[PDB]
Symmetry: C3
């Protein structure tokens, strides 16, 4: 097998999302920019390492890449590569806007092409099964569109960002019903339980992208999106002992994207003088959870229980 699973890309993804969330606090806190820079540099280094390892996989492990691409469930994790690429471009935009725009466009085109080629292929039927409805399916159809929308908004293409954001939002609200019904009916295997944290992602990622596109204006839509996001957060907090029933694992980084988007939207709301206490609580909670994830990853690295 390949040492690095494609699902490990959630580490740089979450770190970059948290870096952007901290970047949004540049003015109110002098060390916020330093924290954002540190997080962004760490995320960029991790993303570079993972991209090189995935290139090695393509060159010498193309059979596994083909298997995961053709699988009805594992293909969704390949969408983490363009998402993390767009996030790294967003990070670099504070230093080199040209490289940032190049990376953002590369990631947007890559994720759009991947969704067109694979997510639409499922409509043919026969390969996708009722037990293939996993939370990871948000990554190609939902998370990628929101990330592309936010990145394009960062580049100034606000109308194209609106298009991508709407695509992601409607895909999210069109897929989540069947996903939740399947979770209610057919449970979820322990090895796939860590991916339940992706259920927290779309609700907060949508509001983060919307606030990025519309210059951080807190409309009724953003408040509604936090309503659902906090409902989901409470639901998953009550289920966390069941998610980690078999123990802590690197798969819990799936919560990282949701937590970082929650922190970003929390900064946006705090800037708007709306639900300031709730925003502070959400930001602190997301930061503490991501710090615990980082500590767990460090412990796994030291103990050697990280790579496969």
């Amino acid at each position: 097998p390949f040492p690095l699973p494609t699902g490990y890309f959630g580490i740089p993804l979450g770190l970059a999302a948290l870096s952007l969330a901290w970047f949004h606090l540049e003015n109110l806190f002098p060390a916020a920019r330093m924290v954002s820079d540190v997080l962004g540099i760490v995320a960029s280094a991790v993303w570079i390492l993972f991209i090189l390892m995935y290139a090695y996989k393509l060159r010498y492990y193309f059979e596994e890449v083909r298997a995961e691409y053709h699988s009805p469930v594992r293909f969704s994790f390949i969408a983490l590569i363009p998402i993390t690429t767009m996030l790294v471009g967003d990070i670099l935009y504070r230093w080199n806007p040209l490289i940032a725009e190049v990376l953002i466009w590369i990631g947007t085109i890559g994720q759009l092409l991947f969704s067109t080629l694979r997510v639409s292929e499922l409509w043919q039927g026969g390969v996708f099964e009722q037990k293939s409805t996993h939370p990871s399916f948000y990554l190609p159809a939902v998370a990628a569109n929101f990330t592309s929308a936010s990145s394009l908004a960062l580049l100034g293409y606000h109308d194209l960002g609106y298009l991508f954001f709407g695509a992601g939002m409607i895909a999210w609200i069109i897929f989540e019903p069947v996903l939740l019904q399947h979770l209610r009916i057919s449970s979820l295997e322990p090895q796939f339980r860590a991916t339940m944290g992706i259920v927290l992602a779309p609700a907060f990622v949508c509001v983060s992208a919307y606030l990025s596109i519309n210059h951080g204006e807190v409309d009724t839509l953003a408040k509604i999106l936090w309503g659902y996001g906090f409902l989901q957060l409470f639901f998953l907090l009550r289920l966390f002992p069941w998610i980690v029933e078999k123990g802590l694992n690197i798969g819990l980084w799936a919560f990282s994207f949701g937590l970082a988007s929650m922190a970003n939207s929390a900064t946006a709301f705090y800037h708007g003088n709306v639900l300031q206490g709730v925003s502070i609580f959400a930001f602190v909670f997301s930061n503490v959870m991501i710090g615990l994830l980082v500590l767990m990853t460090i412990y796994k690295l030291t103990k050697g229980q990280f790579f496969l």
Copy 2:
């Protein structure tokens, strides 16, 4: 078996919702305030009686309470208690704002905790079944959130009300698809057919809550919500002979929440000079239907076919 099914809480629930709907017509009609006061007092008395009966059930019938709480389908009716509590708090707000706030907060916390502890347990799987997808599932995930949002808006917490309203709205949008698909596929047993009236509830309850939070402004969202609510109302009117295939019963009070929310939104739309004729028709239809429900309940009480 306890003489009071947990589903009988829809009587005070609908009566209180209609009382608030009439309260909204205080200025336009001099006896509207008297009608609202009468409805609110009757609803409060019925709610107090039912709360005492349920406390008796807890003290001496805790086995049945546990069975209904752990059931994947019957648990949803326990959410009627916090909803009725919040509605009674809303009623009392016109007399004792402090008691109203206390009841509203108690109900909001209770329903949020119930949804977190039970609606999220279903995701574990193995207990919820495809045949457990019933209209009653709206009560914990949807109706409770809308009622909490409207109550908080009544207290002045408009942003928290927006959060709760969005949670309820997105929960409704996420659950209704599978519910309607199941209804199309697996029919519905006669004993559960009376609960089909809850399908009418979310569309009108959402617009009622939205108009409560945003100071009764008729936005495009309210018009859209009435569009879908009237579509569903026509759909259920065509199905009413099928719903009462085995005769009228106290289960028809499930329509009461939808009718009362329709009346409240009708008052809100009439105040805004938007579709005044349709608003008057909806208000009159809701009042007449709830009066018919009250007459049926009185007939059952006299005949002795009310308690189980």
Copy 3:
């Protein structure tokens, strides 16, 4: 059987939608009004011919009409008659507003009654099956409501148009999840693959109706709707070789409604100076695709492969 399938009504439907889209370009081009008039006249003639054929069917083939009405899947195509009637009324509104209003009201009442009588009857269950979830179900529940909303907006009834538009939009959002899940799970049979083009319709029909009701003011909702519409357009472009695996057929006109609504929304967006390049591309693409459909229909007619 009867020579003309009820699904052939998509020809006048698509032609009329494209005629309205071109009519929206009256001022920009001198020949735009002439093109719109030609398209509208051809669509009206085809609709008159098909209505006469369907009247002949009712008088002398009522058994087939009853069979398609009672079928859980074939009934949806009967909604094409009121939809095309409303579109023809919209066309005639430029010449005889009174006849246009009469036709629009007749079509609105007919489609509303059909949905109430049949779409709601499916909730009884036992006749609708998991394999009856086809894209054609959009026609009675979604496309009809959007067309009625747009037609009513054309007549000046903007609030009633908003009601119908919201009904259609929420019906679309409530049905698409299970439809896409079924498509992913079970492959659509080749004879029903041509109807996959109806999946493209709702996303663009919704934005077209919204622009018609709100005076073509490009709002965030319109941009979101284009986002999802273009996502679905790419998805179906990837799938087109699979849709026509067994060859081209008159069933491909199902794409006509989606393409024409895309063209109409393209005119609306170009008017507002929002994504002008994308608007031009969408308009040209829709016009070229509908022209290809027209050429295919002409070739089928010449080769005697059009009627059954």
